[PDB]
């Protein structure tokens, strides 16, 4: 399943090429960091919390779920 | 003329792609900088 | 230094400080050559690599005569072919 | 270092002209032969790997 670089004539492999990603997936990646801050979102402070703590807490406190021991949502 | 998949670090070593044939590992010429050979861009390529 | 036991004491002790000083870096050169030898041994099989030629993967269709065989590649067309007299 | 004092005491005309030659002549002829075999192979395996 790997993909390597081969000589033309000898058909003898030479290198080992790293990855296999479609170019449209490279356009899916952000590199711009669209700056918005939680004060700009009024009237959703219930939904703001339970969105953040269900996502950010398994990314900065991994042991905190594992201290009790559950799978994160 | 072809279409480039990606570059890679430390070295030119561009991954190229053509219409129905294979994908190659290529290099530049002297007449162009390595600047405007950004990824996912159509380029013209000699036959040998 | 013919036979005074205090000078012939020091006769080889100006030498044993030298004869062990010449033997220490000689075995360091052995380890530098040995690591050079193993790196050389890989670079010689790489010479032995670049005579090999890739081989067409095919498939056998039937057998006409003892030497006339008939195959078709995974490229394309059907070929009439021979073999080795050992295989 | 005590026995090498006594080996210069007990026999003065048996090994003092002999032992200080025979394990130093046969050392230095092996040292002369092996300082050039290692070194000339050292430069070759640098060159032939290049």
UniProtKB/Swiss-Prot annotation, chain A:
Subcellular locations according to the entry: Cytoplasm; Nucleus
Disulfide bonds: none
PTM notes: Sumoylated by UBE2I in response to MEKK1-mediated stimuli.
Disease: Deafness, cataract, impaired intellectual development, and polyneuropathy: An autosomal recessive disease characterized by early onset of deafness, cataract, severe developmental delay, and severely impaired intellectual development. Patients later develop polyneuropathy of the lower extremities, associated with depigmentation of the hair in that area.
Family according to the record: Belongs to the AAA ATPase family.
Summary of subunit composition and partner proteins: Component of the 19S proteasome regulatory particle complex. The 26S proteasome consists of a 20S core particle (CP) and two 19S regulatory subunits (RP). The regulatory particle is made of a lid composed of 9 subunits, a base containing 6 ATPases including PSMC3 and few additional components. Interacts with PAAF1.
Function noted in UniProt: Component of the 26S proteasome, a multiprotein complex involved in the ATP-dependent degradation of ubiquitinated proteins. This complex plays a key role in the maintenance of protein homeostasis by removing misfolded or damaged proteins, which could impair cellular functions, and by removing proteins whose functions are no longer required. Therefore, the proteasome participates in numerous cellular processes, including cell cycle progression, apoptosis, or DNA damage repair.
Name of the molecule in the record: 26S proteasome regulatory subunit 6A
Organism encoding this protein: Homo sapiens
Taxonomy of the source species: Eukaryota, Metazoa, Chordata, Craniata, Vertebrata
First-to-last residue of the parent protein present: 148 to 220 of 439
Swiss-Prot record, chain B:
Disulfide bonds: none
Domain of life: Eukaryota
Locations listed in the record: Cytoplasm
Chain positions with N6-acetyllysine modification: 19
Induction cue: Expression is not cell cycle-dependent and occurs throughout the cell cycle.
UniProt PTM: Monoubiquitinated by RNF181.
Family named by the database record: Belongs to the AAA ATPase family.
Subunit structure of this chain's protein: Component of the 19S proteasome regulatory particle complex. The 26S proteasome consists of a 20S core particle (CP) and two 19S regulatory subunits (RP). The regulatory particle is made of a lid composed of 9 subunits, a base containing 6 ATPases including PSMC2 and few additional components. Interacts with NDC80/HEC; this interaction is detected only during M phase. Interacts and SQSTM1. Interacts with PAAF1. Directly interacts with TRIM5. (Microbial infection) Interacts with HIV-1 Tat.
Its job: Component of the 26S proteasome, a multiprotein complex involved in the ATP-dependent degradation of ubiquitinated proteins. This complex plays a key role in the maintenance of protein homeostasis by removing misfolded or damaged proteins, which could impair cellular functions, and by removing proteins whose functions are no longer required. Therefore, the proteasome participates in numerous cellular processes, including cell cycle progression, apoptosis, or DNA damage repair.
Protein name: 26S proteasome regulatory subunit 7
Organism for this UniProt entry: Homo sapiens (Human)
Lineage per the UniProt record: Eukaryota, Metazoa, Chordata, Craniata, Vertebrata
Recorded name of the encoding gene: PSMC2
Residues of the full protein shown: 98 to 145 of 433
């Amino acid at each position: 399943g790997d993909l390597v670089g081969v000589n033309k004539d000898s058909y003898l492999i030479l290198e080992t090429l790293p990855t296999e990603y479609d170019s449209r997936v490279k356009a899916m990646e952000v590199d711009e960091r669209p700056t918005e801050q939680y004060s700009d979102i009024g009237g959703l402070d219930k939904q703001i919390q339970e969105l953040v703590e269900a996502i950010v807490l398994p990314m900065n406190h991994k042991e905190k779920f594992e201290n009790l021991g559950i799978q994160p949502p | 003329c072809t279409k480039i998949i990606n570059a890679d670090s430390e070295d030119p070593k561009y991954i190229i792609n053509v219409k129905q044939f294979a994908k190659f590992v290529v290099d530049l010429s002297d007449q162009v900088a390595p600047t405007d050979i950004e990824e996912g861009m159509r380029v013209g390529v000699d036959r040998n | 230094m013919a036979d005074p036991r205090d000078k012939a004491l020091q006769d080889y002790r100006k030498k044993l400080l030298e004869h062990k000083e010449i033997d220490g870096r000689l075995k360091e050169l052995r380890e530098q050559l040995k690591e050079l030898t193993k790196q050389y041994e890989k670079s010689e099989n790489d010479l032995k690599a670049l005579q090999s030629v890739g081989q067409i993967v095919g498939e056998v269709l039937k057998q006409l005569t003892e030497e006339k065989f008939i195959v078709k590649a995974t490229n394309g067309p059907r070929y009439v072919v021979g073999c080795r007299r050992q295989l | 270092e005590q026995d090498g004092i006594g080996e210069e005491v007990l026999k003065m005309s048996t090994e003092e002209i002999i032992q200080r030659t025979r394990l130093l002549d046969s050392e230095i002829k092996i040292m002369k032969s092996e300082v050039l075999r290692v070194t000339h192979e050292l430069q070759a395996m640098k060159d032939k790997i290049k």
